[PDB]
Amino acid sequence: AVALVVDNGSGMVKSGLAGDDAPKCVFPSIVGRPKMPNIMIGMEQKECYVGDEAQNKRGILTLKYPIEHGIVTNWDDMEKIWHHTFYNELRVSPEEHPVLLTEAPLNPKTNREKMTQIMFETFDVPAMYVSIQAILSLYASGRTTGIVLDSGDGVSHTVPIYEGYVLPHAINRIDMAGRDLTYHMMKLFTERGHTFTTTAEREIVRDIKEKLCYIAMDYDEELKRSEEHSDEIEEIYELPDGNLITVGSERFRCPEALFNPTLIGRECPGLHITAYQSIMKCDIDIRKELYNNIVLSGGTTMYNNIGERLTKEMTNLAPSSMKIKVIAPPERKYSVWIGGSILSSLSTFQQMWITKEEYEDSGPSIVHRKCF
Amino acid sequence: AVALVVDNGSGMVKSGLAGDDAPKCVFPSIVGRPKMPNIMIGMEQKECYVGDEAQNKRGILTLKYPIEHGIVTNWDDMEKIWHHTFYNELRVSPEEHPVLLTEAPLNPKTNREKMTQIMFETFDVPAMYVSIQAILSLYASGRTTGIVLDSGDGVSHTVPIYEGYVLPHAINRIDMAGRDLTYHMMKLFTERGHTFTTTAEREIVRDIKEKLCYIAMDYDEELKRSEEHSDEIEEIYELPDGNLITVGSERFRCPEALFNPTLIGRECPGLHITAYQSIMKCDIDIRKELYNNIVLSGGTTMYNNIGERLTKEMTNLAPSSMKIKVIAPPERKYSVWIGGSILSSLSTFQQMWITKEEYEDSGPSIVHRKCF
Amino acid sequence: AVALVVDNGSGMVKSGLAGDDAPKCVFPSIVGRPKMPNIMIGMEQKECYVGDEAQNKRGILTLKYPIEHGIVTNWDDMEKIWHHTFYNELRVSPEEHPVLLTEAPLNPKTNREKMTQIMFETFDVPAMYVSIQAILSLYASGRTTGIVLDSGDGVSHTVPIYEGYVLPHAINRIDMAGRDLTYHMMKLFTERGHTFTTTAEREIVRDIKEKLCYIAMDYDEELKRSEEHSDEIEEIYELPDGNLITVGSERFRCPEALFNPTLIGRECPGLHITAYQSIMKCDIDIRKELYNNIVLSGGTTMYNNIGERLTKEMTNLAPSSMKIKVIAPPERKYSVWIGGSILSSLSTFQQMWITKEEYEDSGPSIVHRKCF
Ligand SMILES: C/C1=C\[C@H](C)C[C@H](C)OC(=O)C[C@H](c2ccc(O)cc2)NC(=O)[C@@H](Cc2c(Br)[nH]c3ccccc23)N(C)C(=O)[C@H](C)NC(=O)[C@@H](C)C1
Ligand SMILES: C/C1=C\[C@H](C)C[C@H](C)OC(=O)C[C@H](c2ccc(O)cc2)NC(=O)[C@@H](Cc2c(Br)[nH]c3ccccc23)N(C)C(=O)[C@H](C)NC(=O)[C@@H](C)C1
Ligand SMILES: C/C1=C\[C@H](C)C[C@H](C)OC(=O)C[C@H](c2ccc(O)cc2)NC(=O)[C@@H](Cc2c(Br)[nH]c3ccccc23)N(C)C(=O)[C@H](C)NC(=O)[C@@H](C)C1
Ligand SMILES: Nc1ncnc2c1ncn2[C@@H]1O[C@H](COP(=O)(O)OP(=O)(O)O)[C@@H](O)[C@H]1O
Ligand SMILES: Nc1ncnc2c1ncn2[C@@H]1O[C@H](COP(=O)(O)OP(=O)(O)O)[C@@H](O)[C@H]1O
Ligand SMILES: Nc1ncnc2c1ncn2[C@@H]1O[C@H](COP(=O)(O)OP(=O)(O)O)[C@@H](O)[C@H]1O
Ligand SMILES: [Mg+2]
Ligand SMILES: [Mg+2]
Ligand SMILES: [Mg+2]
């Protein structure tokens, strides 16, 4: 019985079969509902559109995200999304395959309890398991020592691991990700005379950010250069309705909020500062090994010149006798899914499943004593 | 029980049976009354002539139009016209067939209430229904996405529809149609020495307009050409009394008021401007689909070189990366009736009729909550 | 040298001298142009009418608004309006008095740059300054802590201020104001059989809205009452040509779009929702102080039963242990001008002017680093 790997993010949902090295079904996590009267009798209509079929007809729909900051807010929408994933994307009966789920660290217990209850009572899966995302990201890299910096759409967290042992007192988690960058980009576009307010406009701005953004090495010099010669960074983007929008300095002022959250109005520290403070809460012996195995993960770390900028920032904070190597592997967008698929194929893991009888005898609270 | 399709316009009335692709009874909507003393005893005379029998003996009659700008002004004349349609044209008892009626958008509620009350108390039809004309025009084309530009004799309106959902905030309606063009033609004929004042003269001018009018591609160049060489556009028309009238430039200066209502003294915008402003009030995503499904309807859109002129005007207003296709199907004069006949034959529509018992229990106000 | 206070709105222009508590020249912001041939030789005519002299002879004029949503669209018309204000309304040379201007938040930089360039090159004022409207509205109330909800003719925005410090990350701005309400009223009047299309008809509808509108406490019950007994809310309004129009339910269905923008077809949230979301983006400590200092401003907040309705809506959203007090002072129509006049008389402000030499040495870009 091949297991199912389902990574439920805040902006995207990945799903596939264990043993493969690439997810088979990746689609946005949105629920669309119509806001207009239906007049044309004779054509069938649906109450709610889930996934890509809500991203194409979004002009007449209102879109909802059922997950905010890695926490499920609406459970009916999440049930609809899981049903769509199981029966419309993979088309495999969930009553014959074990399911491996992922979750961010430092989350409420009720989230895990409700997830287990839904997975066991509605779909009636044989076995299930919940694991942390940073552990799977480290699994996907084929290492055992390093500090993992994961950053997705709702939450970014750093976790150190040394030779198979995790240090829970040095785990950090902040709520600042690509959605805040999208909002910052929307705010910056106002200064040029362009206004985006609706959800579809937000998706357009998100696509613009994903296409035309990069990280600058020296922020002050780039701002100075954006005055004497701004023509070198100008780009033209074609709106879906045929209009053309000019993107200039906003190509590098949007991601800068990752290293300076004061721009968006947040008091939380930056990314390099967070990594350094997470390293400094570990024992003095393992700091040298942690400094040389920095691993990047998530979709928000896909900008250009991210590894070099992070290395330069870390160098100014670390002792002069220390070597810093920021590992930024390709295809890190799906690193968590690859790590989960690798973990689910190990022969040793077959005795760590939460079976149906154990849940029935113990209840939804069993997920705390078994899963970490 | 086959339903009756009755399209009540401002200048013409179409009527027929559901399932056919061509109206069976098309006749003008006029009520004629004599204005001369009757002397010849022995021959029968009637107080009022309705339909074609008032168009032939119009020399001794005064003609009244009971509908102005899609609004019924005199209800007794409309009752007479409906009686003539039911008992003299189709010769089918209205007490056994459901009736499907049409109406222009953005009309007063009292019109619909009075129409329902008359159809239910006088004729005592089993079931009835009222629908918008643009929806039926889109039904007749076999599509689901597009912007419909309907233009008849009293009112011209544009309505966008996207995948079965109508956008009521983007519906436009102006009162400028073939009757205003007839008045403009009458005014233009004065400059050549010809005067038309009576109603029969108005009908003659209307026939001249329907026969010898076309739309020019370039107005200024055509006006310039109408001086150096006017003989190429000269036509001779035989008046009913045998006289000959010469029609020259007025062949293309009459319809030009559709794209420039300032000629007739109106401040309303043109047709292409109205279509563009109706497209621009929709969401940015569906504008591309609306731009490629422009549908023409009504009898006023039957001029020559109308589609090419509309396409050229729309091209200068749309973004350069957009494709515009003006759909101008033949037999679009009766497109609304064809769409209504198609709609009335669907098996799904059989549960959307306003039955007699519902009207009796609720009153004439039921037509608002059920019909759109 | 007494300064000049000039508040440039989207529908009205206020102007006066610093130190007074009431604007001296208030007039609409419209530019009128004739659309008819001039035949009577011997009487002088003007190419364009600005201000009240275009509101009286509007029957033969086409009227243009040079400001849309707080953004100047046509600069020639704005120059004409400023010239009329300086030389025809106040009759004071602008070459001897400093000028204080106002602007809505979150506006393009080019607007401010062009405004400064025009004020410094054409009129050649000694000093100038640009400030936000909500700050002046809070100045006029004699407070330092509160959330200001300004709503005029083109844009409505909310800004929180705590003890002299503004929170730019909690400032909201939406484009929904009295002009949209006028359009909604025009659409509602169609259902009774009345049609307004021209600009003068729009002004008539605006006057009707300003005279006979109020806000209902319970919308559903009012709609139910408007059926059993509609005679209690009927009013008669005399049209300028002597006709009488009956205004019934539309007295309270027009302003309802402020608390439900879905009626007019907009996806933006209501006013109470916007205020609540602007309060919830501030720090937890200052929310209690913000909840008790809600200040209303603008001309669109002049309806009846607005404060009570806003208080009732806010109560259902705030925690049960919080006290909400909506401050709705009289003469809030000119609150921004009063606040600007108070600010311009302070002895401390005399060192915050943009002098001519600084602009000459730095350019039109100086307005960004000095003015907020
Ligand atoms: C950007 C887009 C199309 C664009 C029209 C494509 C073209 C290419 O850009 C322009 O034409 C820039 C132009 C503009 C540019 C410079 C200027 O000194 C004034 C206006 N901007 C405008 O007219 C503003 C007016 C405006 C409203 Br109301 N409140 C606002 C708040 C802040 C700023 C401006 C505004 N405007 C129409 C919009 O934002 C509209 C709603 N935006 C869209 O529909 C998105 C989905 C696509
Ligand atoms: C056009 C018709 C017949 C026509 C006689 C057929 C022939 C073929 O056309 C002419 O002979 C053109 C001729 C004419 C031509 C050139 C000219 O420098 C002067 C007159 N026009 C006239 O005599 C005018 C005189 C007129 C009266 Br009074 N007020 C008017 C207001 C404006 C203009 C002119 C007038 N006239 C007799 C008419 O309009 C009559 C009432 N029209 C008809 O019965 C219609 C139903 C059919
Ligand atoms: C409201 C005004 C005067 C009024 C005549 C004053 C009087 C007091 O009201 C009436 O008589 C109501 C009456 C009417 C009432 C009930 C009814 O079942 C049918 C008509 N309405 C009409 O005749 C419509 C006809 C109409 C044209 Br075309 N398209 C329209 C689109 C929608 C609705 C109706 C129409 N009509 C003449 C107008 O709108 C004119 C253009 N409106 C004006 O000039 C304004 C500036 C002042
Ligand atoms: N090439 C790219 N450049 C910059 N940002 C990107 C790129 N690709 C994706 N993103 C951002 O990453 C986010 C997706 O992250 P993802 O890892 O899918 O989150 P989750 O963990 O919730 O699945 C998107 O919001 C997008 O803004
Ligand atoms: N071949 C044609 N060329 C130009 N105009 C025409 C032609 N046929 C009809 N018309 C105009 O169209 C009008 C009829 O439109 P119609 O669709 O019957 O209006 P309604 O919607 O009221 O029935 C007439 O007034 C006539 O002037
Ligand atoms: N007494 C009133 N009742 C309701 N609405 C009003 C009243 N007075 C003015 N208004 C509305 O307020 C608008 C004027 O707002 P104003 O503050 O002058 O805008 P601006 O900020 O552009 O100057 C007008 O469009 C009008 O519709
Ligand atoms: Mg993730
Ligand atoms: Mg028609
Ligand atoms: Mg204002």
Residue numbers in the entry:
A (entry chain C), B (entry chain A), C (entry chain B): 5 to 376
The authors write:
Malaria parasites (Plasmodium spp.) have two actin isoforms that differ from each other and from canonical actins in structure and filament-forming properties. Actin II is one of the most divergent actins among eukaryotes. The structure and function of actin II are not as well understood, but mutational analyses have revealed two essential functions in male gametogenesis and in the oocyst. Unlike actin I, actin II readily forms long filaments in vitro, and near-atomic structures in the presence or absence of jasplakinolide reveal very similar structures.
JAS stabilizes both actin I and II as well as canonical actin filaments. The binding site of JAS is the same as for phalloidin; between three protomers. The average resolution of the actin II filaments with and without JAS are similar, 3.3 and 3.5 Å, respectively, according to Fourier correlation, using the 0.143 criterion. The helical twist angle for filamentous actin II was -167° and was not affected by JAS. The D-loop in our structures has a closed conformation (P41 and E48). Notably, the distance between R62 and D289 in JAS-stabilized F-actin II is shorter than in F-actin II without JAS. JAS strengthens the interaction of R62 (SD2) and D289 (SD3) between two adjacent protomers.
